[PDB]
Amino acid sequence: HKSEIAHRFNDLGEKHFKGLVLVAFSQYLQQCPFEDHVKLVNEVTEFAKKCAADESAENCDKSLHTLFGDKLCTVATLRATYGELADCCEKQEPERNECFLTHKDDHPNLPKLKPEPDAQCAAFQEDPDKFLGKYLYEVARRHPYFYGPELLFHAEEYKADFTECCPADDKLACLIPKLDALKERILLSSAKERLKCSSFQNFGERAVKAWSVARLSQKFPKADFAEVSKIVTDLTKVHKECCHGDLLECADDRADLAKYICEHQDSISGKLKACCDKPLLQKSHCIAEVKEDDLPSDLPALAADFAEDKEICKHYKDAKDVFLGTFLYEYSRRHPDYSVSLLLRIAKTYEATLEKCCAEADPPACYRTVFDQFTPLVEEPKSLVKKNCDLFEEVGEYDFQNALIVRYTKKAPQVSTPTLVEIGRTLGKVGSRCCKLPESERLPCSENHLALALNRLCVLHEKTPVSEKITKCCTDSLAERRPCFSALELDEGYVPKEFKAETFTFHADICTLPEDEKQIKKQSALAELVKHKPKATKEQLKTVLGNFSAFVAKCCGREDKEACFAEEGPKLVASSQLALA
Ligand SMILES: O=C(O)c1cc(I)cc(I)c1O
Ligand SMILES: O=C(O)c1cc(I)cc(I)c1O
Ligand SMILES: O=C(O)c1cc(I)cc(I)c1O
Ligand SMILES: O=C(O)c1cc(I)cc(I)c1O
Numbered sequence: 001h002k003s004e005i006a007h008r009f010n011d012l013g014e015k016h017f018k019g020l021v022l023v024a025f026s027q028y029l030q031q032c033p034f035e036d037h038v039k040l041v042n043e044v045t046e047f048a049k050k051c052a053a054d055e056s057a058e059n060c061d062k063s064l065h066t067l068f069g070d071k072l073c074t075v076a077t078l079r080a081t082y083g084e085l086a087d088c089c090e091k092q093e094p095e096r097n098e099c100f101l102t103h104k105d106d107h108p109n110l111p112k113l114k115p116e117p118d119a120q121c122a123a124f125q126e127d128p129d130k131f132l133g134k135y136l137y138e139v140a141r142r143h144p145y146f147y148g149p150e151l152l153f154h155a156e157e158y159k160a161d162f163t164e165c166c167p168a169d170d171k172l173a174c175l176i177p178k179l180d181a182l183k184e185r186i187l188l189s190s191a192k193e194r195l196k197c198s199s200f201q202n203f204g205e206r207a208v209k210a211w212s213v214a215r216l217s218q219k220f221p222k223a224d225f226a227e228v229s230k231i232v233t234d235l236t237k238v239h240k241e242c243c244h245g246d247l248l249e250c251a252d253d254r255a256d257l258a259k260y261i262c263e264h265q266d267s268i269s270g271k272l273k274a275c276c277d278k279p280l281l282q283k284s285h286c287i288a289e290v291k292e293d294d295l296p297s298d299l300p301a302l303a304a305d306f307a308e309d310k311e312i313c314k315h316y317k318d319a320k321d322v323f324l325g326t327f328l329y330e331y332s333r334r335h336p337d338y339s340v341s342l343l344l345r346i347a348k349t350y351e352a353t354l355e356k357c358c359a360e361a362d363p364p365a366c367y368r369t370v371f372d373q374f375t376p377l378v379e380e381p382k383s384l385v386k387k388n389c390d391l392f393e394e395v396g397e398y399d400f401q402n403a404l405i406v407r408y409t410k411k412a413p414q415v416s417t418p419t420l421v422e423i424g425r426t427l428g429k430v431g432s433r434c435c436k437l438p439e440s441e442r443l444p445c446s447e448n449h450l451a452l453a454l455n456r457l458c459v460l461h462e463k464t465p466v467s468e469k470i471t472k473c474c475t476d477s478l479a480e481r482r483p484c485f486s487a488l489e490l491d492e493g494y495v496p497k498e499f500k501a502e503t504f505t506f507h508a509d510i511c512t513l514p515e516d517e518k519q520i521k522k523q524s525a526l527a528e529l530v531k532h533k534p535k536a537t538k539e540q541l542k543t544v545l546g547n548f549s550a551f552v553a554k555c556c557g558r559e560d561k562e563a564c565f566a567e568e569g570p571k572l573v574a575s576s577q578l579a580l581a
Pocket of ligand 1: 115
């Protein structure tokens with residue numbers, strides 16, 4: 001890295017480089033229009049090229065963040081558009097970058113990416129590069145911690161979507177479901193990555209490593225610990241870089257990691273073969289999403305090393321991180337059936353148990369039961385997975401979301417309704433994602449995914465702290481975030497939001513809404529019902545919401561939708577309150 005920009009440019013190649021720089025900028029400057037960003041990345045890419053041509057050219061030896069940060073800081077109306085980021089631009093690197101990062105907007109609340117399949121295919125044909133670029137921009141700026149290389153990957157998917165659908169007859173129906181599925185994948189990936197970044201940010205790299213160790217151990221149970229460690233080290237670096245906005249380095253290192261992993265796929269997992277026969281983004285993505293390898297038949301019994309060995313305390317004092325790390329690896333690799341956070345909690349408990357036991361007189365007698373300390377850690381979420389998947393399976397996603405929305409509005413009524421609705425909806429999306437899964441997968445799926453949504457909440461909460469319960473759950477141990485949240489009950493301290501009839505007042509407008517947004521409106525109402533009536537049981541809320549849904553469906557099916565809403569809503573608005581006592 002004589003010229004780090006030349007280096008990244010050469011490594012990544014212009015398409016990916018430009019894409020990542022676009023992502024980077026879009027993420028750092030989420031409000032600057034697409035075209036601004038494009039000129040920004042073109043300038044940066046031109047400069048990258050100039051540097052690759054001659055790495056001794058002036059400023060070519062400046063760091064990527066110096067370079068890009070500078071480019072960002074040159075944007076038109078940086079102070080009017082980003083009064084916060086202005087000050088960042090006053091700052092040198094890495095302070096500047098740290099500032100930009102800090103001012104990343106996790107909830108830019110930009111317009112909903114909705115297909116305009118005619119206009120968009122049009123723009124995809126007019127310039128597919130400007131269109132996929134635009135996509136990178138849109139998604140990136142909506143998700144300023146979106147995993148850059150992954151975004152490029154998704155850009156590829158998105159392209160494929162417009163490649164397949166734009167020529168198609170019902171381009172809209174060929175495309176929208178793809179784009180919808182893609183948004184779900186985006187949202188999920190964004191959340192995954194945001195979690196990673198949040199984890200660095202809020203818990204540090206060790207937390208991320210522990211997480212990755214657990215995860216990768218599950219994913220690559222056959223890989224030995226050194227291997228998982230190496231990959232976790234690298235992957236953590238990749239995520240660290242991506243999260244710290246070092247997207248070129250992140251991508252480059254990710255590519256390297258993918259290469260490494262694929263070079264060692266037999267040392268790592270048989271599930272990689274499909275990933276490693278893919279091109280670089282697709283390969284990386286595939287490894288990132290790779291299904292867990294089969295448990296090896298030679299998984300070591302764990303009691304000997306981790307419970308029975310008489311010098312465990314010695315190992316544990318002598319090499320805490322390595323011993324624990326390997327414990328985590330072992331437990332995790334044998335526990336794809338556990339969420340990562342469960343494995344971490346288990347690791348934490350294993351650690352806590354050595355801490356306890358090893359400070360005790362006969363540590364071996366004490367930690368010999370260590371594996372048994374994990375049991376309640378396992379049962380708690382397994383029980384929730386069952387409780388909630390039962391519920392989900394019983395009531396379906398909407399009502400599950402309602403459930404969650406109620407629960408979370410209860411837990412954190414201070415949270416904006418849109419956020420509760422979002423979180424509860426995403427949380428219910430866990431029901432959909434995880435409850436249908438093979439039973440051994442629901443727990444990992446659901447807790448991992450809840451980690452994402454909770455992190456989302458946390459992330460949103462960072463920006464918009466409204467609840468201390470949220471803060472605590474979000475900032476106390478990450479492994480416990482989900483249990484912390486799950487454990488949250490009705491914030492008793494919450495003064496019920498004053499009643500605003502209007503809030504629960506629907507109008508014919510809701511009828512034009514696609515069912516998702518109709519639901520969201522209802523679910524917002526729902527959150528509001530909770531906020532106003534926090535102690536309303538979830539069942540009262542459900543009935544009231546059912547009443548609202550009923551009235552909404554009715555009045556929407558009405559000849560005069562609005563007369564209907566106007567006549568029936570108020571009574572409903574008033575009565576539903578009595579139903580929430
Ligand atoms: O328009 C887009 O760029 C777009 C992008 C995604 I990701 C999802 C949907 I639905 C979209 O319409
Ligand atoms: O998710 C990722 O960012 C990721 C990327 C690569 I390359 C390898 C693994 I394992 C991952 O988990
Ligand atoms: O709502 C929960 O607290 C919850 C927790 C877990 I772990 C799994 C599922 I599915 C849930 O719904
Ligand atoms: O379907 C449910 O079980 C459900 C659960 C809760 I908690 C709140 C609402 I509204 C519901 O509709």
